[PDB]
Amino acid sequence: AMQVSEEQQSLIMEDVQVLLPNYDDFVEDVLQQFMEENPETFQIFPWADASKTAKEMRSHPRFKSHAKSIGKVISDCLVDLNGVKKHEPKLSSLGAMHTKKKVPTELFGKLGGCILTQVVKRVSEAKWSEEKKEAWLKAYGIITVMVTE
Amino acid sequence: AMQVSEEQQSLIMEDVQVLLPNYDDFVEDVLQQFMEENPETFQIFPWADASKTAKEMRSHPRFKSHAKSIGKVISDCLVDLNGVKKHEPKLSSLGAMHTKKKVPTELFGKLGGCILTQVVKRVSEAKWSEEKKEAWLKAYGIITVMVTE
Ligand code: HEM
Ligand code: HEM
């Protein structure tokens, strides 16, 4: 039941289109808010420079490049949620970076709150809905499993 | 006095030539021994997979790629120790990865012991000497400062 309905896939694709024209900005907004709200990430991300604010980090090539990388895994999963197992072997080595010992498990929940917040910011008020909220949350759950397992 | 004598530069260049034909193997030998002797590096290197031995990690593309990266910084410094400040801005972002909080400071000493051990393994017994030992140790000290400061 790690499967989304066809209607959930479709609601997601409809927000992916809204996000596509500014997709890189969207993903950097997410990582910047995540780092603002969870300051311990400046010790977990090796490239993060603890003498700078998240917003100062946003200019750094290593912030941009980490956002582009997670941005790609998320994009590839969102666009075909049920067929996500095709990405299995290219993913593969993510598991070892995301163990409980390296990444405190409650940070996954936090990062999903940040994705949902930036999604709400880019989607129109008229289009956002409870059903979309549940489709994105379920989607985030599947992406989570791919990156940890 | 972060400066090596011309004679120390020259003793180093003479070992760099011995290492060049197998340089990548040499640097992977170093990282593999470092990870065998200091098991906590499997929590510090994010890509390291704690369910595997260092030697099993050696096959992984992320082990090979991390060894190639440190291998390049070391090579570039060794070949012109006194003029190392030319590399300053390409280095730059290494500092934030190597703070005391992210990397326990006594591990620098450990990693330098591993470089010296693999250097002794590749250099002939007839050529290795006390003066070379001191030239490499001093060289390692300068490379250390470049990567932390
Ligand atoms: C399901 C959500 C997540 C996705 C899709 C994701 C994606 C990725 C990807 C693709 C990489 C490898 C990037 C590269 O090769 O440079 C990565 C690395 C990493 N991630 Fe995640 N990640 C997620 C959750 C988290 C969380 C919550 C944290 C907490 C800080 C986190 C921390 C890390 C760390 C420490 C690494 C090695 C990171 C790095 O090397 O900068 N990840 N992630
Ligand atoms: C003077 C000796 C050292 C040199 C020349 C060196 C070199 C480098 C380089 C060039 C990088 C960036 C590679 C990249 O962009 O992917 C790096 C990252 C890193 N280094 Fe070092 N390093 C040294 C000492 C250490 C020590 C003793 C440790 C202890 C574990 C260490 C742990 C790390 C960590 C956690 C990172 C981020 C590493 C990674 O992202 O895998 N380094 N180092």
Cα A53 to ligand 1 centre (Å): 19
Of B113, B105, B138, B132, give the one whose Cα is nearest residue B1: B138
Resolution to one decimal, Å? 2.3
CA-to-CA distance for A135 and A78, rounded, in angstroms?
10
Angle CA A78–A72–A98, to nearest 5: 90
For A37, half-sphere exposure in the C-beta direction (CA atoms, 13 angstrom radius) is 17
B123 DSSP 8-state letter: S
Q: How far is CA A128 from the centre of its chain?
A: 18
CA-to-CA distance for A41 and A45, rounded, in angstroms?
6
Kindly report the nearest CA distance between residue B99 and chain A, in angstroms.
9
Angle CA A76–A82–A83, to nearest 5: 60
Could you tell me if B40 and B110 are in contact, meaning their C-beta atoms sit under 8 angstroms apart?
Answer: no
Of the residues B97, B102, B116, B136, which should be mutated to test ligand 2's pocket, given the most ligand atoms within 8 Å of the CB? B97
Cβ neighbours around B118 below 10 Å, total: 20
Q: Which domain, by its residues, includes B143?
A: 1-149
* DSSP states along A30-89: HHHHHHHH-TTHHHHSTT--TTS-HHHHTTSHHHHHHHHHHHHHHHHHHTTGGGGGGGHH
Could you tell me if B57 and B35 are in contact, meaning their C-beta atoms sit under 8 angstroms apart?
Answer: yes
Could you tell me if B28 and B67 are in contact, meaning their C-beta atoms sit under 8 angstroms apart?
Answer: yes
Is residue B1 within 8 angstroms of chain A, CB to CB? Answer: no
Backbone phi and psi for residue A30, each to the nearest 5 degrees, phi listed first: -65, -50
Could you tell me if A63 and A46 are in contact, meaning their C-beta atoms sit under 8 angstroms apart?
Answer: no
Check which CATH number belongs to the domain holding B91 and give it: 1.10.490.10
Ligand 2 site, residue B91, Cβ cutoff 6 A: no
Is residue B43 within 8 angstroms of chain A, CB to CB? Answer: yes
CA-to-CA distance for A136 and A141, rounded, in angstroms?
9
* DSSP states along B93-114: THHHHS-TTTS-THHHHHHHHH
Reduced to 3 states (helix: H, G, I; strand: E, B; else coil), residue B3 is coil
Q: Which residues of A touch B102 (CB under 8 A)?
A: 43, 46
Q: How many CB pairs under 8 A join A and B?
A: 37
Could you tell me if B132 and B123 are in contact, meaning their C-beta atoms sit under 8 angstroms apart?
Answer: yes
Question: Exposure string (b/e) for A35-64, b if CB count within 10 Å is 16 or more?
Answer: beebeebbeebbbbbeeeebeebbebebbb
Could you tell me if A108 and A44 are in contact, meaning their C-beta atoms sit under 8 angstroms apart?
Answer: no
Of the residues B94, B110, B114, B138, which should be mutated to test ligand 2's pocket, given the most ligand atoms within 8 Å of the CB? B94
Q: Which of B47, B99, B102 sits opposite A96 (nearest CB)?
A: B47
Cβ neighbours around A138 below 10 Å, total: 18
Residue type, A124: S
CA-to-CA distance for A34 and A111, rounded, in angstroms?
6
The bound ligand whose nearest atom lies closest to the alpha carbon of B95 is 2
Technique used to solve these coordinates: X-ray
Biggest CA–CA distance in chain A, Å, is 46
* Number of domains forming the structure of chain B: 1
